[PDB]
Amino acid sequence: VTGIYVKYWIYVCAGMFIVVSFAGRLVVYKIVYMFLFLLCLTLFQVYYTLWRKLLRVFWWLVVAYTMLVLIAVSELFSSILIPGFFLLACILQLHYFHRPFMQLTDLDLAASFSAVLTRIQVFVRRLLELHVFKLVALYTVWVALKEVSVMNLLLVVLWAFALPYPRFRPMASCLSTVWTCIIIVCKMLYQLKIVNPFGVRKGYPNGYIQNHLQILLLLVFEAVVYRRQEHYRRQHGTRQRLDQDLLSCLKYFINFFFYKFGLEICFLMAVNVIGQRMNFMVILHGCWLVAILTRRRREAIARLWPNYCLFLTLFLLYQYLLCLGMPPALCIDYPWRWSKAIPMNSALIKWLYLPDFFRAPNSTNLISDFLLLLCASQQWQVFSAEGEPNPIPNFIHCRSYLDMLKVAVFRYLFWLVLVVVFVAGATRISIFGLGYLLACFYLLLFGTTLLQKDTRAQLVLWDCLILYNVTVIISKNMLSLLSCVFVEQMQSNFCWVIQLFSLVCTVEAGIIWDSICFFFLLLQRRIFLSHYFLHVSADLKATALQASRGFALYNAANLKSINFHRQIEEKSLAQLK
Numbered sequence: 001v002t003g004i005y006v007k008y009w010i011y012v013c014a015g016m017f018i019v020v021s022f023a024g025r026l027v028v029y030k031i032v033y034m035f036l037f038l039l040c041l042t043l044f045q046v047y048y049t050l051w052r053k054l055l056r057v058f059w060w061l062v063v064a065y066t067m068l069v070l071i072a073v074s075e076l077f078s079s080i081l082i083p084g085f086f087l088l089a090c091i092l093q094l095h096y097f098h099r100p101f102m103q104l105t106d107l108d109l110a111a112s113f114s115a116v117l118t119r120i121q122v123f124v125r126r127l128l129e130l131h132v133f134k135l136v137a138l139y140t141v142w143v144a145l146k147e148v149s150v151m152n153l154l155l156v157v158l159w160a161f162a163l164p165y166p167r168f169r170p171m172a173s174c175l176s177t178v179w180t181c182i183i184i185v186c187k188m189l190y191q192l193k194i195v196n197p198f199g200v201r202k203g204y205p206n207g208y209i210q211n212h213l214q215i216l217l218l219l220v221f222e223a224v225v226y227r228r229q230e231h232y233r234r235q236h237g238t239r240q241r242l243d244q245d246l247l248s249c250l251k252y253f254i255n256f257f258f259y260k261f262g263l264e265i266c267f268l269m270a271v272n273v274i275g276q277r278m279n280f281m282v283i284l285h286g287c288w289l290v291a292i293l294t295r296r297r298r299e300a301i302a303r304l305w306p307n308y309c310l311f312l313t314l315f316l317l318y319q320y321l322l323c324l325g326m327p328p329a330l331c332i333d334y335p336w337r338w339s340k341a342i343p344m345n346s347a348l349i350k351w352l353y354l355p356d357f358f359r360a361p362n363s364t365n366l367i368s369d370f371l372l373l374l375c376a377s378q379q380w381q382v383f384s385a386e387g388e389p390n391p392i393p394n395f396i397h398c399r400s401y402l403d404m405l406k407v408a409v410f411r412y413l414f415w416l417v418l419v420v421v422f423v424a425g426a427t428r429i430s431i432f433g434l435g436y437l438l439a440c441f442y443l444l445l446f447g448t449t450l451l452q453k454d455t456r457a458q459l460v461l462w463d464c465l466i467l468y469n470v471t472v473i474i475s476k477n478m479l480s481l482l483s484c485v486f487v488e489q490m491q492s493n494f495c496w497v498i499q500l501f502s503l504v505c506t507v508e509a510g511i512i513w514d515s516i517c518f519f520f521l522l523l524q525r526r527i528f529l530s531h532y533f534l535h536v537s538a539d540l541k542a543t544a545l546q547a548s549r550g551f552a553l554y555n556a557a558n559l560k561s562i563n564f565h566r567q568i569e570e571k572s573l574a575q576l577k
């Protein structure tokens with residue numbers, strides 16, 4: 001207990017200070033002073049100016065806060081109790097939990113706990129991108145959803161154009177913390193009962209500042225993790241190691257999952273956002289995806305990556321700005337929505353991503369675009385971060401458990417892809433379904449002969465098929481307009497146009513079979529290039545070289561059987577004679 005108190009002390013003080021909220025209405029003593037002190041301490045910790053370099057000043061400021069609280073001190077039956085408890089807690093933390101805390105800040109379960117803690121800390125530190133990603137998710141899914149307005153666009157923009165540029169990431173994070181503190185102050189200011197009628201607070205439960213508090217808590221947790229990693233670091237290959245057992249391969253993928261499949265995952269996330277949003281902006285996304293994908297060689301992808309990333313981040317910023325525009329203070333309306341008889345209506349203004357007060361554009365899909373941005377930034381980092389033919393004969397045959405998986409992946413997956421293509425084609429009625437069915441049929445008929453072909457024609461035909469699939473994706477995205485904007489009019493005019501395509505409105509979901517088909521096709525395209533498949537193709541060629549002997553052996557067996565029967569009949573007839 002003494003060690004726990006000496007170690008985990010400041011957290012109790014922070015919790016006690018935070019517990020001072022919901023003190024009826026807004027009182028400067030209740031919030032302003034305490035909230036300002038907590039914000040100053042948190043900002044000092046984030047910037048490491050005092051709370052991580054002059055913690056004596058931190059203790060002095062804690063003592064000063066306790067003195068101010070004392071100077072400040074059923075109406076007062078319970079209100080006079082929380083300040084006393086907070087003062088007592090601060091005095092206790094300053095009595096014994098101050099010097100040992102500063103010093104520390106400068107049974108088979110034991111081994112398991114040690115291993116779990118070491119793995120978690122190593123992951124948080126080395127794979128700091130994961131932490132950054134969690135903080136980004138908590139800073140985007142809240143600002144873009146809860147309070148979509150000014151005073152939250154600054155932090156969103158800062159992080160959005162900090163993620164693809166890690167050189168700006170550290171200071172930007174600190175700036176975000178400062179901005180969060182400012183937002184918190186605003187949330188504390190607007191909660192007062194002195195308003196009486198951008199980004200108004202309108203505090204209902206006075207739970208209306210939980211977003212900024214959670215963002216600050218996540219930032220503090222990330223900073224604490226980084227500081228602990230630095231303290232541990234100051235104190236106290238894999239590819240060849242792949243082919244021993246399943247555990248080694250699992251650990252190797254845990255290490256370098258993104259390094260090899262980042263482009264595939266980014267394409268999959270682009271398809272996912274395309275499916276989820278389904279608008280004109282998505283038409284732009286699809287056009288740019290085909291533009292990148294047309295250049296087949298990876299070096300062209302390297303050349304065109306920075307343009308992709310910059311275009312996508314500026315597109316995200318434009319989307320967020322377009323979400324919040326023309327504040328309702330000026331009662332004038334947008335240059336489109338008049339009382340005129342212009343052909344546009346509510347359906348088209350919903351489809352076309354435009355700001356309208358009657359139907360504000362959705363703000364729970366920017367998350368998918370931001371995830372795509374994160375994938376693109378990680379892949380840009382990977383791009384900037386730049387014998388087996390002996391083993392592969394030995395996985396052509398079976399060993400402990402890695403060989404079975406290798407043969408099931410590099411040999412028995414070319415047919416699962418065809419099965420998935422057939423299922424996708426036959427599970428939804430359209431012209432695209434017929435095209436998928438015909439492609440699957442042709443591939444299945446000419447499977448083995450295609451496998452034994454050289455890599456060139458194989459990649460040519462595979463790229464043709466995947467480009468047809470992405471063309472189908474973009475065509476469905478295009479026709480979603482006529483599927484939703486002009487449902488009744490087109491239905492009355494023509495019902496066969498609704499027959500030939502899936503005209504239902506989508507509004508993970510939507511094009512799911514198509515997405516997995518795209519995934520499997522891209523995976524098989526990647527497989528066709530690895531060395532592992534080379535000697536599987538060699539085995540197929542060897543099987544082709546055969547088939548001049550099986551017929552001979554069947555004939556030999558037939559001759560053996562017929563001659564045995566003949567001999568027994570001759571014995572019988574000799575007996576008869």
Ligand SMILES: CCCCCCCCCCCCCCCCCC(=O)OC[C@H](COP(=O)(O)OC[C@H](N)C(=O)O)OC(=O)CCCCCCCCCCCCCCCCC
Pocket residue numbers: 119120123124126127251254255
């Ligand atoms: C939400 C919480 C989840 C928590 C999960 C915890 C468990 C999962 C952990 C995830 C795996 C983490 C693996 C990290 C691997 C780091 C590799 C690494 O730093 O590269 C090696 C480093 C740095 O090389 P470089 O300068 O970039 O390039 C050198 C050269 N140019 C080249 O081509 O490269 O150069 C070096 O020489 C340094 C080598 C250091 C290697 C560190 C890893 C050691 C082995 C793996 C340990 C952990 C494995 C996973 C455990 C999983 C447990 C379930």
Ligand SMILES: CCCCCCCCCCCCCCCCCC(=O)OC[C@H](COP(=O)(O)OC[C@H](N)C(=O)O)OC(=O)CCCCCCCCCCCCCCCCC
Pocket residue numbers: 249260388405406409523526527529530531532
């Ligand atoms: C309720 C029903 C549930 C049904 C769920 C079914 C689950 C099925 C899981 C199947 C797992 C297979 C996924 C692995 C993905 C394979 C695709 C892939 O990664 O390509 C292989 C890549 C590409 O080659 P390369 O490393 O770059 O080669 C170096 C160089 N380029 C060269 O070639 O020169 O690099 C590699 O070659 C790496 C090869 C590693 C592949 C290992 C696969 C492990 C499979 C794990 C299956 C475990 C099943 C457990 C069953 C439990 C039952 C209770």
